[PDB]
């Protein structure tokens, strides 16, 4: 219903070759999924996992700025790989889905079932709408620079509105011992973190140069701007990550870079197959 | 050729009017906005 038979006919694959290709896909794609889970999860948690773990770290200054900048990195590289090599537009969504799968597994088994923290206190939460819109921008524009601009803007801007339905109810006010707190703050105080005291929270604190009514908005744009840079940089990093050569040697013992080329991609190879 | 002289004599008079109908409007659309206080 898509155009798969035409693609297979253009590739000149006999039925056994088609079955072998299907087996290659079924073997390699789960491997890529697991690698994305592991590596992207490590990168995200060790760069932005602290705001990710706890409800009271989700603030208006650092969370919506740090999170998208860290998240765009693997997404840009994987999108480069998929789009450039196979014309596949689901890179960023796949990255964020893998990250969320790993995050949910660790929160349920590590934080909750081992450390006895409640599940609602460790919602990560989502970063998916921005990745989806970035994928849609890359597919519709087909240009990676226009994709950098527009998709990075979307990725940096849609983070806070997309997470507001999850963490908005946690901002309801409570009064404890005559002191006003957000419900996330009282959840953080209620469930003791022996290794995490209050003063380590890198959250907003207000300033005499600060417009309290615009804070998130400013954080929504700065995180966007850097994203437009970060994407671009990591897009070039994708070209570094796709570098596939061999160190061959001969005679004097000299080492030369050698590239294995696809024979089907040559000038007259497809016509001579028949 | 001739289509060069004519396609280009048509974009001279075409470009000099998308300039004079945008000059006028843009000044009329921004006043209607300035004097109307839209927003």
């Amino acid at each position: 219903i898509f155009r798969t038979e035409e693609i297979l006919k253009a590739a000149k694959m006999p039925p056994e070759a088609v079955h072998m290709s299907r087996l290659i896909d079924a073997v390699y794609f789960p491997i890529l999924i697991i690698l994305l889970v592991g590596t992207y999860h490590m990168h995200f948690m060790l760069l932005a996992g602290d705001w990710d773990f706890w409800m009271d770290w989700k603030d208006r200054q650092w969370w919506p700025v740090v999170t998208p900048i860290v998240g765009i990195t693997y997404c840009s590289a994987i999108m480069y790989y998929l789009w450039v090599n196979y014309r596949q537009p689901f890179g960023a969504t796949l990255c964020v889905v893998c990250l969320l799968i790993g995050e949910w597994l660790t929160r349920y088994w590590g934080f909750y079932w081992w450390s006895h923290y409640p599940i609602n206190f460790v919602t990560p939460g989502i970063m998916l709408p921005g990745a989806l819109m970035l994928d849609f921008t890359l597919y519709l524009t087909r240009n990676w620079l226009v994709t950098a601009l527009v998709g990075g803007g979307f990725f940096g801007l849609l983070f806070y509105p997309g997470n507001w339905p999850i963490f908005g109810p946690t901002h309801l006010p409570i009064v404890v011992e005559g002191t006003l707190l957000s419900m996330a703050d009282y959840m953080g105080h209620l469930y003791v973190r022996t290794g995490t005291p209050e003063y380590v929270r890198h959250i907003e604190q207000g300033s005499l140069r600060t417009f309290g009514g615009h804070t998130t908005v400013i954080a929504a744009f700065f995180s966007a701007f850097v994203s437009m840079l970060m994407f671009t940089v990591w897009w070039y990093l994708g070209k570094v990550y796709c570098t596939a050569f061999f160190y061959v040697k001969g005679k004097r013992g000299r080492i030369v870079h050698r590239n294995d080329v696809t024979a089907f991609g040559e000038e007259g190879f497809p016509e001579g197959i028949k | 050729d001739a289509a060069t002289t004519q396609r280009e004599i048509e974009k001279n008079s075409g470009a000099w009017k998308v300039i004079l109908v945008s000059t006028a409007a843009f000044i009329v659309i921004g006043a209607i906005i300035w004097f109307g206080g839209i927003g």
Binding site: I24, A48, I78, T106, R107, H116, T194, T243 | -
Partner: protein, 254 residues
Amino acid sequence: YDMSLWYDSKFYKFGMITMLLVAIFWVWYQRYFAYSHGMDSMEPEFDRVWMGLWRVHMAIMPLFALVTWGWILKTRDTKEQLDNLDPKLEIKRYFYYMMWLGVYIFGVYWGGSFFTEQDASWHQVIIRDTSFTPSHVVMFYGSFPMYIVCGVATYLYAMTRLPLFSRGISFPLVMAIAGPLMILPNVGLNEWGHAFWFMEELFSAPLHWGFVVLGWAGLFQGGVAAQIITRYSNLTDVVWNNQSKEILNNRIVA
């Protein structure tokens, strides 16, 4: 047609299930011995339990490396056998190489993702990070070396059974493995930062950024897969499209 001539998956399935069972055993050990014998590092029971597990890891993982690497290097293919290799057997061997990569990546997932947020989880129920904390034993001394062995074994197999890998040096594969490999020595940086003025409170601290830079090398899977797909296309052309074998031996010569 005959599937078995160019595909086999028994070893891959066995490795996957074995790694999953080992991870489940580690999880059960953590959930059974951490609150009762892992709270105090100076207690004799802490020694007998967690340092005993550490010693078990320190004695088993080198044995794992020795056995796997020695078996791979011992049943090697000579240059004669790698020059007249049956292309169907080459497809099967590339499937085997992808499965070795999959086992290595499963080990990396266990080390860097699951048994790392479980550590942050442990970092918040304890006063301060130690060095042989329940968490560390299972990953730092268990999961870390585990994936490293698989990584070496993966490359080993390739550059022993795949002629191309025995010919030139797969640059992307090198980094893909060296990355998580070099992650284990970064435990020194981790400990040095925790014990001294690099602070310990945050899990996303600058001293924890060595792991992300070293794991960025895992993104050379793009080059690894590019090489694999190019060779797979060449093998498909040779075997099924009746094309000349010269495309398999033309571009990786001196």
